[PDB]
């Protein structure tokens, strides 16, 4: 689920890597998840 912003496990993987076999539509969606996780402090900005 490219939307679940708590799966550090999986999300971890894409750290934001440029099109990550992700597609134009998958990406971005990703990115917002990733950007939500970050605020939660789940993922890192830098």
């Amino acid at each position: 689920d490219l939307r679940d912003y708590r799966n550090v496990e999986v999300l971890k993987r894409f750290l934001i890597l440029p099109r990550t076999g992700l597609s134009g539509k998958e990406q971005r969606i990703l990115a917002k998840t990733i950007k939500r996780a970050r605020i939660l402090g789940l993922l890192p900005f830098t």
Binding site: R3, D4, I29, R36, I39, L40, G41, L42, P44
Partner: protein
């Protein structure tokens, strides 16, 4: 009425009783602002990725509720008050993608 996801990071160093209180607070809130809770999740402590409130670890809450979109902002304000609540993020629920 709408489906949102609550998300809450609470100070990790509380005690059974402090913790229970915050949670008791959160629920009147949830209730007061007309939110009917569909389900709660408590992943608790988690390593984090950058320091939040100095602590490099937080206690994670969640809740999926049902409430009047017009009160979501009021609710969040509510929940933020508490000195142990150092992160509150509400979000419109959405089906999982893929």
């Amino acid at each position: 009425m709408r489906r949102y996801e609550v998300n809450i990071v609470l100070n990790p160093n509380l005690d059974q009783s402090q913790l229970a209180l915050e949670k008791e607070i959160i629920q009147r809130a949830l209730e007061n602002y007309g939110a009917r809770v569909e389900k709660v999740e408590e992943l608790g402590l988690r390593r984090l990725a950058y320091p939040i409130a100095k602590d490099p670890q937080g206690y994670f809450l969640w809740y999926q509720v049902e409430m009047p979109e017009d009160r979501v902002n009021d609710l969040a304000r509510e929940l933020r008050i508490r000195d142990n609540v150092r992160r509150v993020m509400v979000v419109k629920s959405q089906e999982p993608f893929l």
